[PDB]
Structures are given as structure tokens and as C-alpha cells.
Amino acid sequence: SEGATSEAQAYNPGVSNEFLMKIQTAISSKNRYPKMAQIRGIEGEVLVSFTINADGSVTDIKVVKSNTTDILNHAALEAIKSAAHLFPKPEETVHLKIPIAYSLKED
Secondary structure (H helix, E strand, O other), X not given: OOOOOOHHHHHXXXXXXXXXXXXXXXXXXXXXXXXXXXXXXXXXXXXXXXXXXXXXXXXXXXXXXXXXXXXXXXXXXXXXXXXXXXXXXXXXXXXXEEEEEEOOOOO
């Protein structure tokens, strides 16, 4: 209970949490639960990645690791595809990873 917005920055050692926190709220805003999975109550986690080029745009959007069904893996990645235009613009090509989670419970 009562941690911080910080497990995603721990995946990208060297990133500022103040920068990385802006990614999490951009994805979560367009993130949606796949209604078909909730009929049975499938849950888990999806470690999604992407690259932001020095052109100030997002590319190479993919699931690197997962511990859930492929419909949930793709629904997590749809929020990266939907937040790609919402991410900040760097002076450099940079590669980032965010663990997305899906669950119905409180824990």
C-alpha cells in the first residue's frame, strides 16, 4: 500500500520521474479495459515499450514482456498508440518501457 509513481522509472534507470510520470498519465487517459475479457475476469500485466526519435514523434511501439492474454496485451499497447501523439518531443532518439496493469479487484 501507499508507494509512489515510480516502478516504470525503475525499468528505465537514468530517467527523471518528473518526465516519466507524464508518460503514465498520458497512456492511462486513453487506456480502456477490453470488455470481452471482463465477462470472465481475465487480468495481469503488460510491459510495453516504444522509441521517440529526435524528430519529436513516436515509433517502434511493441510489447516486450507480458503476463496476461494477447487481447489484454494488445489493449495495453492501444493506449501507447493512442498516447504516442501526446508524449513530449526530445532532442535525441530515446527508448522507453512502461508496465501497464489490468485488474478488477482492489489490491
